[model samples]
Target chain A: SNHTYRVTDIVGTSPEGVDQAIRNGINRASQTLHNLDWFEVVEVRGQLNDGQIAHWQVTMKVGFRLDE
Target chain B: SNHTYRVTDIVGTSPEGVDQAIRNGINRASQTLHNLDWFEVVEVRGQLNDGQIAHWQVTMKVGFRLDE
Candidate 1:
């Protein structure tokens, strides 16, 4: 049987890279949501500090299965 | 009152660029869904042929408002 999934949008920020930002976002969302199936990287942006990349901002759409 | 939106994921491929790929995906989705509000670029990837870029593959999460 097919399962219904709910998607939520969130922004994860990290000074390291895109992967870390995604991890941080998922970790935070997992605190309040369960059955997280997967995530898709929505946007990759960053802040500039004096003409250099300061931090990476990653937006992700997280998917979780809805309980029946 | 807050409006409810439903999200769907789709992959759009184009030999041109990322923007074109997104437009293609949105056009295809609009055929079946109404009230297409907005979209978020989920993943940006592509195929390589002969050590060169062949086509752009873009995954997007499209949101549409549900009828009341």
Candidate 2:
């Protein structure tokens, strides 16, 4: 149904990098969100340790189709 | 009406900074898109020459209400 979709923000973190972090975010969202349709990466950044990257934190807008 | 909204990606570049780059993108989109509702910064990056900071390239997903 070409209805409306609700988009929400979620963040995923990982030591691997942005790629794996994106997967983590999607995987986690699947458990809670219904009809997961699409996603777009919003922000990509991470915490620094001693001027080095400690981990990757990727923010995403996960959209889900709404059932009417 | 709480209907669906369509989102599109656009990039804005500026020698000034990311803030100005965002404004440029939105301003340009308004010329083509209708009912522009919201936007999210997807990526932030910049070009570099030698060891100096050059211009900033900002990516955004701008959303607009769909006409019924």
Candidate 3:
């Protein structure tokens, strides 16, 4: 039987950009797992110092079945 | 009266490491949110293919009180 998955908040960062940060998180998770149902981009924002994006942040949700 | 707080899931990724990814989400959240109680690092993992540090994912939780 499959179990309902637990939800968690994750953030991806890239000095590069928000998109890379988003992909970074998903790619990392996929390393030791499978069944990535989908992910939600909840919020997007970044840090700036001296008129530059110091970092980019991407927030998302990942869901999968729980093993018994 | 205070509004009920709604929970949303987010993901963060970084090539550097997991800590940065966690910070990415919170730092982004700080842009529009105030009074962050705290956050928890739910999971950590990395991506690899042909022996390369492809990506990093960090999961977290953030909480704040609703406004009246």
- Considering only N, C-alpha and C atoms within 3 Å, which residue pairs clash in candidate 1? none
Candidate 1 docking classification: incorrect
Q: Tell me the tens digit of each residue's lDDT in model 3 across A1-68.
A: 54577555556667888788777766765654466677788888788999988877676766766666
Off by over 4 Å in 1: B1-68
Among all windows of ten consecutive residues in candidate 3 chain A, which has the lowest summed lDDT? A1-10
Cα lDDT for residue A68, model 1?
A: 94
Query: Which stretches of candidate 3 lie above 4 Å from their native place?
Result: A1-3, A32-34, B1-68
Write the residue-wise lDDT of candidate 1 on B1-68 in tens digits: 89998988878788998756766776777778877766656689989999988999888776678997
For residues A1-68, could you state the per-residue lDDT of candidate 1 as single tens digits? 89999999989888776678888889998999999999988686544333233566788889999999
The superposed Cα distance between candidate 3 and the true structure at residue B5, in angstroms, equals: 21
User: Per-model TM-score of chain A alone?
Assistant: 0.91, 0.90, 0.76
TM-score of 3: 0.46
1 or 3, greater by DockQ: 1
